[PDB]
Design a protein around this ligand. Sequence first.
Ligand SMILES: Nc1cc(-c2ccc3ccn(Cc4ccc(CN5CCCCC5)cc4)c3c2)n[nH]1
Ligand SMILES: Nc1cc(-c2ccc3ccn(Cc4ccc(CN5CCCCC5)cc4)c3c2)n[nH]1
Lengths: 206, 212
Amino acid sequence: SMKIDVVTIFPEYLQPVGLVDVAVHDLRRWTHDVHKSVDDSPYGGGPGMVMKPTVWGDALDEICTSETLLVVPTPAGYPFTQETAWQWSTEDHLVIACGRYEGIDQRVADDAATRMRVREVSIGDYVLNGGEAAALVIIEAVLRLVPGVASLLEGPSYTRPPSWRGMDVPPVLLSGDHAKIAAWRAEQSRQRTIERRPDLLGFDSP
Amino acid sequence: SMKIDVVTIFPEYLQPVRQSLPGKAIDAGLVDVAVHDLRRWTHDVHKSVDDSPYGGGPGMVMKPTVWGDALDEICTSETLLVVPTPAGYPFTQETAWQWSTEDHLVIACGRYEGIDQRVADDAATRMRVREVSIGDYVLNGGEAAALVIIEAVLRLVPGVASLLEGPSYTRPPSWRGMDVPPVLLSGDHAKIAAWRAEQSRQRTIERRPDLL
Ligand SMILES: Nc1cc(-c2ccc3ccn(Cc4ccc(CN5CCCCC5)cc4)c3c2)n[nH]1
Ligand SMILES: Nc1cc(-c2ccc3ccn(Cc4ccc(CN5CCCCC5)cc4)c3c2)n[nH]1
């Protein structure tokens, strides 16, 4: 049993989303002007626009409680990893605040943290157009761990036919020897890990 | 100009990002994103795309025969074939920049427990293949990764660094007892730049020490 509220200026984006309820809210619902303005130019200068804290404050006041875990996707966040997904999988209430433009006024998260637990997180070292794709990633990774639903890369998998275009499934996998298969898979995992993610085994990255 | 083809058993998953393309980029022939249902290339009445893994284990593996036909039809020799996987090379902003100059990306989205390895191995004998991961967590399939990759790449296509970025602020100058840092209102633009650099350094130390 988990409730996830997603707040966004693009609710349509979240369409790809009884053990869990997922609600999507249009941030602009909490505006008061006819222009429904949620952004403004940054103090101190710079390109693009920043989301005003006022509208966010009103939205989160309505949706959050002191028990809420507020998740704020940002390229400057703490890394979201499998460990994080396991941790959040046992939470009662996630609220995901999706930014657009060049991000959200820092006081939204700072103020919220006086009232609830707040987690500014990055899903990877690349820049998205906004938090919505990150919300989908976080929701996917967490929900598959929810009850009722390691440091190595997985090796290759195969299925029928045993030969295809002159490419054979590795013979050990057809041998029925559970121990030999286990050993081979363990070796494949470690070789793939040293090739693709040597950092996971404590070596320098390329 | 770039064409992106996405192959998936859940084509509706990619409907958001297709819609989110500005008409001007499409009209200019700058970008085209097409989404294909993998089951179009199935061989049997049951439209089977998955089968049990050799060597045993849980879950199912996607059939090479179906994928082989799909990629045969969709790919050319100039294609960059992108295969999301939790066991992939890391997709980063450097990767996004590189792929932003490609003419044709094909993204093969797996489900179940992944795709028979011979699909990528065979494809790699006549095109460039990139098995990539978007982060150290496990998704249910490649579609969310495709969304991420498409967004990260396309925002680098015109008209479609070492440290973490610091905090941003806008009006009002005071909100819930919190003032915007006075330096940002100082009109001392060299000082502002130095303040922002220190915020960046501090945030990187706190959140991502690995980057230093
Ligand atoms: N892991 C991850 C999370 C996100 C994410 C999350 C939320 C929002 C809200 C808006 N954006 C787009 C954006 C954010 C910041 C900038 C400023 N920028 C700093 C980095 C270099 C370029 C200049 C520009 C555009 C977001 C991006 N991307 N990747
Ligand atoms: N960066 C990233 C990309 C993906 C991604 C991409 C494509 C597919 C296709 C299917 N899945 C789901 C899946 C794959 C493998 C396993 C088994 N595996 C063995 C032990 C270790 C834990 C997992 C389980 C489920 C995919 C997942 N997730 N995260």
